[PDB]
Amino acid sequence: NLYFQSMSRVLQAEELHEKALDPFLLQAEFFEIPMNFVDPKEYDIPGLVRKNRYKTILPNPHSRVCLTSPDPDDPLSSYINANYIRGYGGEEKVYIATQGPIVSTVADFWRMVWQEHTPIIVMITNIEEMCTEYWPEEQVAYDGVEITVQKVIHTEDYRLRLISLKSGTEERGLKHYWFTSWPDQKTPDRAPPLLHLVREVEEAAQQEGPHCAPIIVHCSAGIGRTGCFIATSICCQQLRQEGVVDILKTTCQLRQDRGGMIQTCEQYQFVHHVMSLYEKQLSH
């Protein structure tokens, strides 16, 4: 409740199923949630224009990812349009939501991957929408870190890249999930590929073992599709643990961390479609 009054609506199975199919109640609920957008005058940094895809979609200062190398005291070098996002039960830094890298922020994005020890990146972008292609065909170096694409795995809904990151003697692995099945119309029949991605990523996150480093999630602005992916991921754990889903409370938690998380009402309804489907799958 730090930045605005959180709201809650605890849904058991029947209400969840019915709520996903009630666009009139969904829009009434959705448009009562504060966007929690940052006033652009909150940042007064020369050269900042080149770091933002959109001038009104800025990272909330309290949860902003600061790039501490090579100069934490330089407001521009330290800047990236990204926020730490709490996971299920308020766990700190489960995710980082960021905008899709642009030409001038490609190297900044890799500085963030390196700083945070990110083991997983989730990219939600259509092949037609091509975010700047920030990974190499085979190999590239950015600020002392050699990035190598070791393997490309093509599945129906995502391209998985197994990437190696090397700097001096230390080597780290990274899994890059490029999801290509984001739908134009957020109808219930388009929910299974997103649910499959959510489940595949949470299993890969568990395989990292204790205190998994932040998972980076991005789409064009880093709020809409990113908000849907993260909200779904949190609610899948809530459903398995508690037997209920609270998409409203989860959306508020996301907005406190980054303004605008779950951008449209159609995206809000889509999360309900995904969660209603997962509840039916779990029931078996």
- State the catalytic residues: 219
Q: What is the nearest approach in angstroms of ligand AY8 to the Cβ of residue 71?
A: 30
CB of 57 to ligand AY8, least distance (A): 6
Bridge partner list, 171: 166
| CB closer to ligand AY8, 205 vs 261 | 261
- Pairing outcome for strands 145-154 and 158-167: antiparallel
Residue 224, annotated as binding a ligand? yes
DSSP string, 27-85: HHHHTTS---PPPGGG---TTGGGG-SSTT----GGGBPP--SS-TT-TTTT--SEEEE
Restricting to residues 5-44, which ones interact with ligand AY8 according to CB under 6 A?
A: none
Residue nearest to ligand AY8 (CB): 221
Q: CA-to-CA distance for 138 and 206, rounded, in angstroms?
A: 28
**Smaller CB distance to ligand AY8: residue 31 or 54?**
54
Nearer of residues 131 and 145 to ligand AY8, judged by Cβ: 131
Residue 239 C-beta: closest distance to ligand AY8, Å: 23
Q: Which of 64, 176, 225, 255 binds ligand AY8 (CB under 6 A)?
A: 225
Radius of gyration of the chain (CA): 18
Query: What does the alpha-carbon distance between residue 81 and residue 26 come to, in Å, rounded to a whole number?
Result: 29
Among 105, 226, 232, 263, binds ligand AY8 (CB under 6 A): 263
* Candidates 69-77, 205-213, 243-251, 261-269; binding stretch for ligand AY8 (CB under 6 A): 261-269
Which of 124, 275, 97 shows the shortest CA–CA distance to 191?
Answer: 275
Nearer to ligand AY8, 68 or 187 (CB): 187
Q: Is 267 in the site for ligand AY8 (CB under 6 A)?
A: yes
Q: Is 54 a residue that touches ligand AY8 (CB under 6 A)?
A: yes
> Does residue 220 belong to the site contacting ligand AY8 (CB under 6 A)?
yes
Could you give the CA distance from residue 169 to residue 260 in angstroms, rounded to a whole number?
40
User: Contact between 224 and ligand AY8 (CB under 6 A)?
Assistant: yes
Among 167, 207, 264, 281, binds ligand AY8 (CB under 6 A): 264
SS3 content of the chain, % helix, strand, coil (to 5): 40, 20, 40
CA dist list (Å): 133 to 95, 103, 125, 141, 267:
21, 9, 11, 15, 25
Q: Is 263 annotated as a binding residue?
A: yes
| 219 appears as a binding residue in the annotation | yes
Distance CA 105, CA 99 (A): 10
- Residue matched to tokens 């605008």: 260
> Which residues of this chain interact with ligand AY8, rule CB under 6 A?
54, 56-57, 220-221, 224-225, 263-264, 267
Would you list which residues are annotated within the binding site for substrate?
184, 219-225, 263
